[PDB]
């Protein structure tokens, strides 16, 4: 049918028709005779793919014809016409070599029973013209055959050693000369543990963390920063465990790597759903997103999901890597310039990524693909470590000649060379995924001078190595305008509304931290003598009737707190939402993808006002469609029509040689133009309509190691076999399962399940057997938690904040009035006897939530006569 | 590759290659040059065939070839 039909059955090629990746008809005899008629779907003409001329293999005792046949050595010049072009006798090679007129090379010809030919001396590379020997450049074109630095030699190659390591007397080797000995450091799920580099001594270094996926540390003073994903904090503790604090709390919704600067004394982190990646000082005072959008200049490679980082302060560049559907592992300085690209083909999972100082080699590994690389920092020669064969690497980290990876389908951390992967040794496994892994020792951070010097080089808030490793650029903090001044930088204090700004101007802090009962700026503005007690916990704004309310919920287009601040025309004037969230004419906020999500979303309903939706400008990365809504450039050219209108469909560019599969990754499905991944074939999921990712699945294979085949024919990572979890529907996974052995903070219930130690006497029986809320009076209880008088546990947080979370309601019995005044409910709540703080709506709302708040107001309300009473 | 008399395997390119490739030099050693060709020698009972080094021979299809390496005889099919 015509282009509007925008849909198409199965076409079944099969004989002459042969649906390319484009899904088009086209004849059997377009293979490259001659042929390229499909230009949609590119198949019929291929440069090399079709192009195999693959006649000249044959065994070695036998001596291919020119004609095409492979007579025998034996039969070479056997005086017989063995070949149509009697190869054998035809060609029959007397002392061509040693024939001085003939046969001229540079280092040493070599005679053969037909013609000639050449060999050169070792280190000298044969020209194209077999006559001519080249010296070959081992520093670069081979830089295995030197341990850390090499020099191009003519014909051989002189490996050194930097600085602190020994050079051995063998030769292309090197030794550490550092007084400390280096072991590994890398976080479990809740765990930090402590491996030395041979793998003899396991520890721990700190326990009691909800979720770790990223470490670094702090040679200068011997810290130890992380990040907790789900509880959303960068912590920083002394490697002697004397201090742990929290540099970072606010606006981390999701941050999956870390990398500690050792130089200008600053800290960078990633942020997934932000995309973007952030800097602040090692106190967090400052922070400032550095870059955002995309990095190649041409919208292509943008952040997606970035997860790993790698500093470089040599140079002051910081590599990264986006497991998107546009993997990159492009670098950035680390003033925030010259962002771009570095490595950019045969790359789907960049999950971990490093640099080995020794040699300046750019390391990285890779999910999916499961193999580890390493290239120059400029990433223009790519030699691999490993083929592939390493199931699910996820971090990695080079030391000496050693490059140590932490895989998540076998749940190890193994070691191997830093350049041919040799000695594959598996140290220790752990129950939990490895995660983020390092080796602590000085020389993993090398002595490099700080072009900043002093004063943040004069600088006001922040100094920022520039490129290069020489010189710095000023910069200010995510609320300041950076004007560049003569000679200088101003930091403009230009700041949204619901946000206080110091007298000293060091930072922005939102306006609920304004007189919280904290000097929230260094030099107290915040917390001015003259103001209102604020009856309120921190993290809530304060209404001027006394009444608290969500920050959230400040300026949200509804008057929540009754005194009417809440949406105040000052306190929402100048107000700006964040960065991913969109903001509406109400001042309502809403997250971009919600612009003109064509959903009434916004109560000003803003977001679908046909005005701004027509002169939407979007992002880079995000393919705009007719409806103005703009889907992520991936959902392009897909079957599935995303916007919602075919025009994110250009059919006639999807079909077209443009939007063609990578033969590394996207699977093309025949029957459509869909390009779904190598990993989303035999997902037990329907990724392309035509089921063709589900067809092979009886003949598609597992990987040997690390994966678990189940009796639907699916492959899933050995770690999900057994998780009490069905990965596979068959249950295969969970079909035969021993109950795993619980770690030092797990506590092992009566039905051999493992659950956080956190969670004995959690008030909730988390275990199925109950077990857990137990002897809950003679537990005591953890440090950080409160024990009600049941005995049971509670947050110390959720002490005396008006919610009886122990059922006793001894967490708020058993404090005083939340202010002096003479009352417990701060916002006009209802106080019952247990002192529990009823919302003033809830206050004899039908049932007694209290539990000695029943109620006589049955005039106001019989609890009989109550709608809420549905059932008698 | 071309076993050497002193028990190495020189390869077949490398045989009579002009080189001391081998202990024994079986490679240079007596290179098979047209031994069948001279009827002197290499007399063979029905197709003498050579080789790289000294020659060799085969029989019509039917003709066992004797232990001396030049006599066929008859094979009994039956
Ligand atoms: C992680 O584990 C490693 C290995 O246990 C710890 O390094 C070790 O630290 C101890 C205590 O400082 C060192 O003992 C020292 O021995 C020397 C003599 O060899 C002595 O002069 C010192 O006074 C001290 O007793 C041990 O040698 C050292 N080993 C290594 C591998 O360097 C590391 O401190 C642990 N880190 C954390 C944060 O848990
Ligand atoms: C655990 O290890 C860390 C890192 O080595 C220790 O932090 C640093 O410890 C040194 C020695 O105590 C401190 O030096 C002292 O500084 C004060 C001034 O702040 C000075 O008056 C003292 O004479 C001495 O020079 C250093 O300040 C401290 N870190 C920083 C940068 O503040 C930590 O103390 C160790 N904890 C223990 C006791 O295991
Ligand atoms: C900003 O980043 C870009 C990209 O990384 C830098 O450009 C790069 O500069 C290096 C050093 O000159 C180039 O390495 C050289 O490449 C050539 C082959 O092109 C090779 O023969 C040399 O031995 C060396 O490896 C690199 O190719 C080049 N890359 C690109 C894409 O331009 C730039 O220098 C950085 N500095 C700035 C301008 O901020
Ligand atoms: C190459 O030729 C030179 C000069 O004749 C000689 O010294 C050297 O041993 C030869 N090497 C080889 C590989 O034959
Ligand atoms: C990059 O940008 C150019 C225009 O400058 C465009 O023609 C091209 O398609 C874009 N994609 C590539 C090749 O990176
Ligand atoms: C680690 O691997 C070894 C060798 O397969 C095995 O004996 C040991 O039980 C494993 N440990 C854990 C915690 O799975
Ligand atoms: C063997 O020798 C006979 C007699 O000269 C000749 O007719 C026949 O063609 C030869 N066959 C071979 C395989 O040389």
Redesign the interface.
Same mark, same amino acid.
């Given at each position: 049918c015509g282009d509007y039909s925008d849909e198409r059955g199965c076409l079944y090629q099969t004989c002459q028709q042969n649906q390319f990746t484009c899904q088009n008809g086209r004849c059997i005899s377009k293979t490259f005779v001659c042929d390229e008629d499909n230009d949609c779907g590119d198949g019929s003409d291929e440069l090399m793919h079709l192009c195999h001329t693959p006649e000249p293999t044959c065994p070695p #005792?036998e001596f291919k014809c020119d004609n095409g046949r492979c007579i025998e %050595? %034996?039969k /070479?010049?056997? #005086?017989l016409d063995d070949c149509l072009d009697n190869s054998d006798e035809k060609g029959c090679g007397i002392?061509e070599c #040693?024939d001085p007129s003939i046969s001229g090379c540079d280092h040493n010809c !070599?005679? !053969? /029973?037909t013609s000639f030919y050449c060999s050169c001396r070792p280190g000298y590379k044969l020209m194209s013209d077999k006559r001519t020997c080249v010296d070959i450049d081992e520093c670069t074109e081979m830089p295995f055959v030197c341990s850390q630095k090499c020099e191009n030699v003519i014909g051989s190659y002189i490996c050194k050693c930097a600085p602190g390591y020994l050079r051995e007397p063998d030769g292309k080797t090197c030794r550490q000369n550092s007084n400390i000995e280096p072991y590994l450091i890398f976080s479990n799920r809740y765990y930090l543990r402590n491996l030395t580099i041979d793998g003899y001594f396991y520890s721990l270094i700190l326990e009691g963390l909800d979720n770790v996926v990223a470490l670094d540390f702090d040679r200068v003073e011997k810290r130890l920063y992380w990040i907790d994903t789900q509880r959303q904090v960068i912590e920083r503790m002394f490697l002697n465990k004397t201090n742990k604090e929290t540099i970072i709390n606010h606006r981390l919704p999701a941050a999956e790597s870390l990398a500690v600067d050792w130089v200008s004394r600053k800290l960078y982190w990633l942020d997934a759903r932000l995309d973007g990646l952030f800097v602040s000082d090692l106190n967090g005072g400052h922070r400032r997103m550095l870059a955002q959008h995309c990095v190649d200049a041409n919208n292509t490679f943008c952040f997606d999901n970035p997860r790993g980082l790698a500093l470089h302060p040599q140079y002051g560049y910081l590599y990264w890597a986006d497991w998107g559907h546009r993997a990159y592992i492009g670098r950035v300085g680390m003033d925030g310039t010259n962002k771009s690209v570095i490595i950019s083909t045969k790359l789907e999972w960049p999950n971990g990524i490093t640099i080995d100082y020794t040699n300046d080699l750019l390391y990285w590994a890779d999910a999916h693909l499961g193999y580890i690389e390493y290239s120059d920092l400029e990433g223009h020669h790519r030699h691999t470590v490993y083929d592939g064969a390493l199931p699910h690497p996820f971090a990695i980290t080079i030391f000496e000649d050693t490059i140590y990876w932490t895989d998540w389908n076998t749940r190890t951390v193994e070691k191997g060379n830093k350049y041919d992967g040799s000695n594959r040794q598996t140290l220790v496994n752990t129950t939990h995924r490895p995660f983020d892994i390092h080796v602590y020792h000085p020389y993993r951070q090398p002595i490099v001078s700080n072009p900043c010097g002093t004063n943040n080089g004069g600088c006001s808030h922040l100094c920022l190595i520039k490129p290069g490793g020489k010189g710095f650029t000023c910069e200010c903090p995510d609320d300041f305008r950076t004007l560049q001044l003569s000679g200088s930088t101003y930091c403009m204090p230009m700041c949204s509304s619901t946000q206080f700004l110091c007298a000293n101007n060091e930072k922005c802090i939102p306006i609920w931290w304004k007189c919280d009962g904290q000097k929230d700026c260094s030099d107290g503005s915040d917390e001015l003598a003259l103001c209102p007690q604020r009856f309120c916990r921190l993290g809530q704004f304060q209404c001027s009737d006394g009444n608290c309310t969500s920050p959230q919920t400040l300026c949200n287009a509804h008057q929540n707190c009754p005194d009417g601040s809440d949406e105040d025309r000052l306190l929402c004037e100048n107000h700006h939402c964040d960065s991913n969230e969109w903001q509406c004419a109400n001042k309502r906020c809403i997250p971009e993808s919600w612009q003109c999500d064509t959903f009434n979303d916004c109560e000003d309903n803003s977001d679908e006002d046909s005005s701004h939706c027509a002169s939407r400008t979007c992002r880079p990365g995000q393919f705009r469609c007719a409806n103005g809504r703009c889907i992520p450039q991936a959902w392009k050219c897909d079957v599935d029509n995303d916007c919602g209108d075919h025009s994110d469909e250009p059919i006639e560019e999807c079909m077209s040689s443009a939007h063609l599969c990578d033969n590394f990754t996207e699977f093309s499905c025949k029957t459509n133009y869909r390009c779904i991944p190598k990993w989303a074939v035999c997902n037990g999921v329907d990724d392309c309509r035509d089921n063709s990712d589900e067809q092979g699945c009886e003949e598609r294979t597992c990987h040997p190691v690390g994966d678990f085949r189940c009796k639907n024919h699916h492959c899933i990572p050995l770690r999900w076999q057994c998780d009490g979890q069905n990965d596979c529907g068959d249950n295969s996974d969970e079909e035969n399962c021993a109950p795993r052995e619980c770690t030092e903070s797990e506590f092992r219930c009566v039905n051999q399940q493992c659950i956080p130690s956190r969670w004995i006497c959690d008030h909730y029986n988390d275990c199925g057997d109950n077990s857990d809320e137990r002897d809950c009076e003679m537990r005591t209880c953890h440090p950080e938690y409160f024990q009600c008088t049941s005995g049971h546990c509670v947050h110390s947080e959720l002490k005396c904040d008006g919610s009886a979370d122990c059922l006793d309601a001894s967490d708020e019995a058993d404090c005083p009035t939340r202010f002096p005044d003479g009352a417990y409910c701060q916002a006009t709540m209802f106080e019952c006897k247990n002192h529990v703080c009823i919302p003033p709506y809830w206050k004899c709302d039908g049932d007694d939530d209290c539990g000695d708040g029943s109620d006589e107001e049955l005039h106001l309300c019989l609890d009989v006569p109550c709608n809420s009473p549905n059932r008698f």
């Open positions: #005792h %050595m %034996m /070479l010049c056997n #005086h002392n #040693h !070599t005679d !053969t /029973l």
